[PDB]
């Protein structure tokens, strides 16, 4: 019943090879719908879902200039963080950013997000109240003081409470056939004498999946991380060394528990 | 839709 919109940004400095690589993607729930890659001949925000192609040219011109401005700012921040951490200009470094909003069945805001990461570790994050920051080190405290002086959180809070959920309600109504309709998985059990039993779940959306005589063997179970099939569906399996498998999903009418049919 | 913001670190 809940929904979300998210934007992921990644800037990786390439010393001696030119400007950093900037890749950003946008998601509505687990459905990709926009992308931007700086390593394109004419870099521009591009559609990745059928329901976003309806947007006019003023949508794409604006989203493209937001990505071009975000890459520009991340280029400055990569050089700025070299000053903060006293690092060499010859080393590659990564800047990851993620922001978005969650809504419920009414379309009202549940939780807003905006968090940074420098070289795989947290940098600065907007707290749940959308008015304060949490810095992970003294370098992010420099950024926090600048972002508090410039009242950055007051615009991010205005976006997460306003434009973010308003954009989200629009995407849910346009692509309702593919976004507001879940798909249950196809299940089967295989046997591999060593012996092992593999409980499969294929072709389901969204990616949220959960896999003797009613008890759980949570420690002797090898659960591979959910993987995308490629057609906007997902896959996942679980193996136990030898006994029944447990399966739940949103699209499933009731939680099925399967057994190995010889 | 993305947010229009320029916030250097």
């Amino acid at each position, epitope marked *: 019943g809940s929904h979300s919109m998210r934007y992921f940004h990644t800037s990786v400095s390439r010393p001696g090879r030119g400007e950093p690589r900037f890749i950003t993607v946008g998601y509505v729930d687990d459905t990709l719908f926009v992308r931007f890659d700086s390593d394109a001949a004419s870099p521009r925000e591009e559609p990745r879902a059928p329901w976003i192609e309806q947007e006019g040219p*003023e949508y794409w*011109d*604006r989203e493209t*200039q937001i990505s071009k*401005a975000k890459a520009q700012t991340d280029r400055e921040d990569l050089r700025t963080l070299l000053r903060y951490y006293n690092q060499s200009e010859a080393g590659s470094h990564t800047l990851q950013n993620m922001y978005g909003c969650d809504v419920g069945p009414d379309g009202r805001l549940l939780r807003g997000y905006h968090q940074d990461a420098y070289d795989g570790k947290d940098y600065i994050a907007l707290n749940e109240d959308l008015s304060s920051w949490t810095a992970a080190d003294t370098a992010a405290q420099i950024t926090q003081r*600048k972002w508090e*002086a*410039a*009242r*950055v959180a*007051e*615009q991010l809070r*205005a*976006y997460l409470e*306003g*434009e973010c959920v308003e954009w989200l309600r629009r995407y849910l109504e346009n692509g309702k056939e593919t976004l507001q309709r879940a798909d249950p998985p196809k299940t089967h059990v295989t046997h591999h004498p060593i012996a092992t039993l593999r409980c499969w779940a294929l072709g389901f959306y969204p990616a949220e999946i959960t896999l003797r005589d009613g008890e759980d063997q949570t420690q002797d179970t090898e659960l591979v991380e959910t993987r995308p099939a490629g057609d906007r569906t997902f896959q996942k399996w679980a193996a136990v060394v030898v006994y029944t498998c447990h399966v739940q999903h949103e699209g499933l009418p009731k939680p099925l528990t399967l057994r190995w049919e010889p | 839709g993305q*947010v*229009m*913001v*320029v*916030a*250097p670190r």
Partner: T-cell receptor, first 113, second 110 residues
Framework: GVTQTPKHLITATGQRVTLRCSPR?????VYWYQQSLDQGLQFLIQ???????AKGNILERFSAQQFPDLHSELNLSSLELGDSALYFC?????????????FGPGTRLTVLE | KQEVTQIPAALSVPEGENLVLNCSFT??????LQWFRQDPGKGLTSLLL?????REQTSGRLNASLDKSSGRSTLYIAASQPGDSATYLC?????????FGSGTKLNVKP
């Protein structure tokens, strides 16, 4: 606050004038504007940490820069009668879209035949 | 490009009157909308800064609104005072540069 020199400037056609600006201490970004009656307040150029960041409808005869001490300079060469206007200088802490600019008193230029 | 228009051009009112100063912009992809006051000899002074995703800002007797979907902004001045006499400039910030409006020359009569 932002200070601009000189306060006034009377000049003739073909002459050249240099306008100066000291941004607020700590401000990294400087802005230059031109305010006339026919065009109003027009944005000319913006510098950030010494590098040109934005450009309005600045003319080729208009030259500007930001020095390492963060103070700026605006040269108006081959002056014409239409250059008679008020030239303002603004400064901001950085390039934040959530923060404001801080303007100086301005320099009034009058070009005569 | 971006065209910023302001209504009205001038305004001579008796003191204590509530004022409505309007601003219109054609490009809605803006980072912020500011309301400046310009005084002869002192320069521009920012009164309010409405963020990109904000719909209104408030500072004492000043209360400005923002509607990007229509490209509108309105600076409300409650209980106008003679000290408020100045040119009120609507400023907008776009991807490329900043744009200003014609301005509203205000004169509050004591």
């Amino acid at each position: 606050g932002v200070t601009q020199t000189p306060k006034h400037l009377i000049t003739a056609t073909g002459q050249r004038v240099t306008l100066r600006c000291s941004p607020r201490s700590g401000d990294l970004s400087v802005y230059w504007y031109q305010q006339s009656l026919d065009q109003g307040l027009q944005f000319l150029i913006q510098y950030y940490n010494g590098e040109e960041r934005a450009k309005g409808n600045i003319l080729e005869r208009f030259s500007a820069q930001q020095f390492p001490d963060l103070h700026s300079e605006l040269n108006l060469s081959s002056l014409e009668l239409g250059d008679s206007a008020l030239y303002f200088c603004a400064s901001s802490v950085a390039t934040y879209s959530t923060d404001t600019q801080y303007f100086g008193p301005g320099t009034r230029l009058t070009v005569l035949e | 490009k971006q065209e910023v228009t302001q209504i009205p051009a001038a305004l001579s009112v008796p003191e204590g009157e509530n004022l409505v100063l309007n601003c219109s912009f054609t490009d809605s992809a803006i980072y912020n909308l500011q309301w400046f006051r310009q005084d002869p000899g002192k320069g521009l002074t920012s009164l309010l800064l409405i963020q990109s995703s904000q719909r209104e800002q408030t500072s004492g007797r000043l209360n400005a609104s923002l509607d990007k979907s229509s490209g509108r902004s309105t600076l409300y001045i409650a209980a106008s005072q003679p000290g408020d006499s100045a040119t009120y400039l609507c400023a907008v910030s776009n991807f490329n540069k900043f744009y200003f409006g014609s301005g509203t020359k205000l004169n509050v009569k004591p």
